Design a protein around this ligand. Structure first.
Ligand SMILES: [Ca+2]
Ligand SMILES: [Ca+2]
Ligand SMILES: [Ca+2]
Ligand SMILES: [Cl-]
Ligand SMILES: [Mg+2]
Ligand code: NA
Lengths: 120, 208, 209, 121
């Protein structure tokens, strides 16, 4: 009954990084590299958390977010950015994100925020 | 002609933001991989991540040295064979199949900075993959650059089309849209026009 | 304005990027050289110590650059000096001198914090063979003042910064080496602050307000 | 040991560790001078098989040292190692060949092979 994570990420070095880190703690990770598939998987299956990059090819990370919440997905969404800035976090919070992180990060930080957000 | 003009403070800050972003990704992945080895369990998987990320950090650094960092008079010339080398190595870990055709020439630095920057536009044109073909035509004194993209998803990257067309963007320039902007700014400084033509099978970015 | 030369946007951009690349060439190279040692075998704990330190160095330099050179959003945006202290501290765990920060975690306009981080670079340059570098944040949020104090066995204002600061016509074209002092001074101008140099035989105090 | 003897002249101590290790791991006997620590003893130069000059910091002017070495007609061959932009032109201008110079970064294989090439000529 392990923790299920939807990873919506395109930069494949980050995705492999996050996959390795999460899977080393027995998380299940289902990753996609297109936002429009992210919107579909998030609308249709159940996850403990969605890790979402702002930097996506077929649309903005924010559109993924805004569409998921407009479709009334209650799944908690952690946003990842390679692009620091206070303004990005706040816009994320405005669109319905639970939390925000900048790359790079350590394994300890990602895991700690996931538990904090999900509450298990 | 360009619908917005960025101050030196803004162009400089955005360009650096962009380089840091693109090189931080593999560097961060490397540290993550190293952290996984000070634990245990994923040692062969971690090492593979460290190795490819290192190779990629290096490829991105080399590409950025010329595409963003090169400097000096138009007399500081650059060999397109050197462009082809950093480009080919950059694109190993990118999605499209990358090919290069054309005879080695020496061009003014701004022309080769343009060329490498158009490859980034090209790479954005086919986000789900495909092929990116470079063709160098003309002579060293008036070359033509032809970047031909094919793939299942195929577009002009929207900010690039917007800026190219003279329309002043609704959104302000950021470390993402700075690279299309920079591309257009290089082309003005180099005395070349970019053209964008679409057919059923491909998009062609050209400059001459 | 009081700066002796003006770079175009294309030039300031190219040179700042050039400087970022120069500063990460050796750590990226070393990671790849360490991996090479690893594969042929024989020096495995050395090659791994080299990879770990090089990878940490690269990360620290990139993260410092991201704030000191990088964008951070729109005109009215502020940066937490707490963030500045973290990237500055991590940057300096890799450099010769010993680094200290005295100041209250406050929100300042972004160019004033970029100025601040850029003065740390000048300060570091001022003591080639090591020593101490100490930051002190003074003043209000509307009128802040930075104090960087350096001590060490050699002590000279970094010549390109000296040149540009005093308003001299540069002896050499601005390049990836001198762009950072140019940039430091460019930031000061934009942020409505001015930098002073107090040199003695024991220390140099770089300050701005 | 009977193996190769290398003087590595460095303008930055921390940047050189990478290079020391590569040389050492090949069982080279490696001696180092830190230009920010001490001048070069020019009396000891005929005692090494090769001299590596590592340039990175322009304010250290290690290029000047290379000039002095050149104009003094040191007989030990010199390999220059740099990642600095601009230096390749200044260094070829002094009369150094293409194989006397190496841009950074480079593969370990490349360094070790170029060293063997220079010493055995
Ligand atoms: Ca659901
Ligand atoms: Ca490829
Ligand atoms: Ca230190
Ligand atoms: Cl400097
Ligand atoms: Mg050195
Ligand atoms: Na692509």
């Amino acid at each position: 009954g392990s923790m299920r994570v939807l990873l919506i990420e395109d930069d494949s070095a980050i995705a492999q990084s996050i996959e390795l880190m999460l899977k080393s703690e027995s998380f299940n990770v289902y990753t996609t590299d297109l936002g429009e598939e992210g919107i579909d998987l998030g609308k249709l299956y159940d996850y403990d958390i969605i890790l979402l990059d702002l930097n996506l090819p077929d649309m903005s990370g924010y559109e993924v977010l805004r569409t998921l919440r407009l479709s009334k997905v209650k799944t908690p969404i952690l946003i990842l950015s390679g692009m620091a800035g206070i303004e990005d976090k706040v816009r994320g919070l405005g669109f319905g994100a639970d939390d925000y992180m900048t790359k790079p990060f350590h394994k300890d930080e990602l895991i700690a925020r996931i538990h904090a957000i999900v509450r298990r | 002609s360009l619908p917005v003009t960025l101050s030196a403070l803004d162009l400089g800050a955005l360009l650096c933001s962009r380089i840091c972003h693109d090189i931080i990704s593999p560097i961060g992945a490397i540290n993550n991989g190293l952290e996984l080895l000070e634990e245990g369990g994923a040692d062969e998987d971690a090492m593979a991540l460290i190795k490819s990320s290192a190779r990629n950090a290096s490829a991105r650094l080399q590409f950025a040295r010329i595409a963003f960092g090169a400097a000096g008079s138009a007399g500081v010339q650059i060999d397109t064979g050197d462009a082809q080398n950093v480009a080919t190595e950059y694109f190993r870990n990118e999605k499209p199949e990358f090919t290069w055709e054309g005879a080695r020439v020496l061009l003014p630095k701004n022309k080769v900075k343009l060329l490498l920057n158009m490859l980034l536009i090209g790479n954005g044109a086919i986000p789900r993959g495909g092929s990116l073909a470079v063709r160098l035509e003309g002579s060293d004194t008036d070359p033509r650059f032809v970047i031909t993209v094919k793939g299942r998803m195929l577009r002009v990257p929207p900010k690039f089309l917007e800026l190219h067309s003279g329309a002043a963007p609704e959104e302000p320039i950021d470390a993402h849209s700075v690279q299309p902007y920079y591309t257009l700014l290089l082309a003005e400084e180099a005395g070349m026009k970019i053209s964008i033509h679409a057919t059923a099978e491909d998009i062609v970015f050209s400059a001459e």
